[PDB]
Amino acid sequence: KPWWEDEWEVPRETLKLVERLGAGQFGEVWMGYYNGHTKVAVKSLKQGSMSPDAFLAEANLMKQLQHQRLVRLYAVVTQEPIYIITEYMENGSLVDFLKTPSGIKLTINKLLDMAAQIAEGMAFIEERNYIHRDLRAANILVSDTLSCKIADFGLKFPIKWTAPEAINYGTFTIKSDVWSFGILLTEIVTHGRIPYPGMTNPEVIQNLERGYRMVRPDNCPEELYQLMRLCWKERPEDRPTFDYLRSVLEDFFTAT
Ligand SMILES: Cc1ccc(NC(=O)c2cccc(C(F)(F)F)c2C)cc1C(=O)Nc1cnc(Nc2ccc(N3CCN(C)CC3)cc2)nc1
């Protein structure tokens, strides 16, 4: 293959962009087709918006992080406008899905299931010594069979999902993902509502420093709430692993 193309290269002609799923800063995201019959998602780089290499580092990363619980890389097009193509999740973002007529009717059993699924994906990430840095419902995709996969739309880390040592020292580890995950759990159980209902960031900041944690969300299973508490332990080293988290969630799930 020529040097000016990636090992994962495909001709642009094999792709047809049909629907804009989101636009913005560094490019856009489209739902499309690969060779007509195969649905795909396509992230396109807004020229000059950021370095092509900078853009393409994400795909090089996904090359080493292939797993069924994570969005799979399909190919790339490295001639402007640069594209990164992945599989296509039909039910969109978890935050949006939890609000559709279907998502709203999801039982606590299904929710715990999806939580374990995400924990499973985070367990793989943990095993590979990678750090997500933005684990939230907004970065979780749902399939037509209602299965979840971790993603990162690459969108100042907004406080509410960011652990103390991260907000204060900029130090991110798999232990801060564990914290973010605890927050993700509130989104799941409340069908997508923003964490810390009615509190501004500095209020959340002052509360955590005092040792306070988020008020028990409405209708949240107390066992689930306590599991969230573990994710919010002061010392990063006292927070659990994702294998443990997946493990407990599977038990709550199989008990419901
Ligand atoms: C195109 C693309 C290219 C790349 C990526 N990359 C990632 O993730 C990613 C990045 C870094 C690290 C990691 C890892 F560590 F976890 F490995 C990942 C993993 C994501 C996408 C990417 O965004 N893919 C995608 C988008 N939409 C959909 N479906 C999708 C999304 C939203 C809706 N929506 C419903 C209709 N509503 C109008 C708009 C929202 C409907 C389908 N399915 C897949």
Coordinates of C-alpha atoms in Angstrom, one line a residue, residues 72-199:
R72 CA -15.4 -0.4 16.8
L73 CA -13.1 1.5 14.3
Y74 CA -14.0 0.6 10.7
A75 CA -11.6 2.7 8.6
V76 CA -10.3 6.2 7.9
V77 CA -9.8 8.5 5.0
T78 CA -6.6 10.5 5.3
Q79 CA -6.9 13.1 2.5
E80 CA -8.9 16.2 3.5
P81 CA -11.6 16.3 4.6
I82 CA -10.3 13.6 6.9
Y83 CA -12.7 11.0 8.1
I84 CA -12.8 8.3 10.8
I85 CA -15.5 5.7 10.2
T86 CA -17.0 3.4 13.0
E87 CA -19.9 1.0 13.5
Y88 CA -23.3 2.6 13.8
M89 CA -25.4 2.4 17.1
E90 CA -29.0 2.9 16.2
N91 CA -30.5 4.2 19.4
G92 CA -28.1 7.1 19.9
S93 CA -26.7 8.4 23.2
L94 CA -27.8 6.9 26.5
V95 CA -28.8 10.3 27.8
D96 CA -31.2 10.8 24.9
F97 CA -32.4 7.2 24.7
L98 CA -33.4 7.2 28.4
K99 CA -35.9 9.9 27.5
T100 CA -37.6 8.3 24.5
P101 CA -41.0 6.6 25.0
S102 CA -39.0 3.4 25.3
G103 CA -36.2 4.5 27.5
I104 CA -38.7 6.1 30.0
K105 CA -40.4 2.7 30.5
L106 CA -37.1 0.8 31.2
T107 CA -37.2 -1.2 34.5
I108 CA -34.6 -1.0 37.2
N109 CA -33.5 -4.5 36.1
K110 CA -32.7 -3.3 32.5
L111 CA -30.9 -0.2 33.9
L112 CA -28.7 -2.2 36.2
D113 CA -28.0 -4.5 33.2
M114 CA -26.9 -1.5 31.0
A115 CA -24.8 -0.3 34.0
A116 CA -23.0 -3.6 34.3
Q117 CA -22.4 -3.5 30.5
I118 CA -20.7 -0.2 30.7
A119 CA -18.7 -1.3 33.7
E120 CA -17.6 -4.3 31.6
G121 CA -16.4 -2.0 28.9
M122 CA -14.6 0.1 31.5
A123 CA -13.1 -3.1 32.9
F124 CA -11.5 -3.8 29.5
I125 CA -10.2 -0.2 29.3
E126 CA -8.8 -0.7 32.8
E127 CA -7.0 -3.9 31.8
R128 CA -5.3 -2.1 28.9
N129 CA -4.0 0.8 31.1
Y130 CA -6.1 3.4 29.3
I131 CA -8.0 6.3 30.9
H132 CA -11.3 7.5 29.4
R133 CA -11.3 10.9 31.1
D134 CA -15.0 11.7 30.2
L135 CA -17.1 8.8 31.3
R136 CA -20.7 10.0 31.2
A137 CA -24.1 9.0 29.7
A138 CA -23.4 11.5 26.9
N139 CA -20.5 9.3 25.8
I140 CA -22.4 6.0 25.9
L141 CA -24.1 4.6 22.8
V142 CA -27.1 2.3 22.7
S143 CA -27.7 -0.4 20.1
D144 CA -31.0 -1.6 18.6
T145 CA -30.8 -4.7 20.8
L146 CA -30.4 -2.3 23.8
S147 CA -26.8 -3.1 24.5
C148 CA -24.3 -0.4 25.5
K149 CA -20.9 0.6 24.1
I150 CA -18.4 3.2 25.3
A151 CA -17.6 6.1 23.0
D152 CA -15.9 9.5 23.2
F153 CA -17.2 12.4 21.2
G154 CA -14.3 14.6 22.4
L155 CA -16.4 17.3 23.8
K156 CA -12.2 22.5 31.2
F157 CA -13.7 19.2 32.4
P158 CA -17.2 20.5 33.6
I159 CA -17.0 19.6 37.3
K160 CA -20.2 17.5 38.1
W161 CA -18.6 14.3 36.6
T162 CA -15.0 15.1 37.5
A163 CA -13.4 13.9 40.8
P164 CA -11.8 16.3 43.3
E165 CA -8.1 15.4 42.6
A166 CA -8.8 15.8 38.9
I167 CA -10.4 19.2 39.2
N168 CA -7.7 20.3 41.6
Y169 CA -4.5 18.7 40.3
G170 CA -5.5 17.8 36.7
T171 CA -4.5 14.3 37.6
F172 CA -6.7 11.8 35.7
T173 CA -6.5 8.0 36.3
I174 CA -8.8 5.0 36.0
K175 CA -9.8 5.9 39.5
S176 CA -11.3 9.2 38.4
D177 CA -13.3 7.3 35.7
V178 CA -14.6 5.2 38.6
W179 CA -15.9 8.5 40.1
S180 CA -17.4 9.7 36.9
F181 CA -19.0 6.3 36.6
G182 CA -20.6 6.7 40.0
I183 CA -22.1 9.9 38.5
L184 CA -23.1 8.1 35.3
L185 CA -25.1 5.8 37.6
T186 CA -27.3 8.7 38.7
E187 CA -28.0 9.6 35.1
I188 CA -29.0 6.0 34.4
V189 CA -31.4 5.6 37.4
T190 CA -33.0 9.1 36.8
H191 CA -33.4 8.4 33.1
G192 CA -30.9 11.1 32.0
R193 CA -31.4 14.0 34.5
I194 CA -28.4 16.2 35.2
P195 CA -26.5 15.2 38.4
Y196 CA -26.8 17.4 41.5
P197 CA -30.3 18.7 40.6
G198 CA -30.4 22.5 41.0
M199 CA -26.8 22.9 42.2

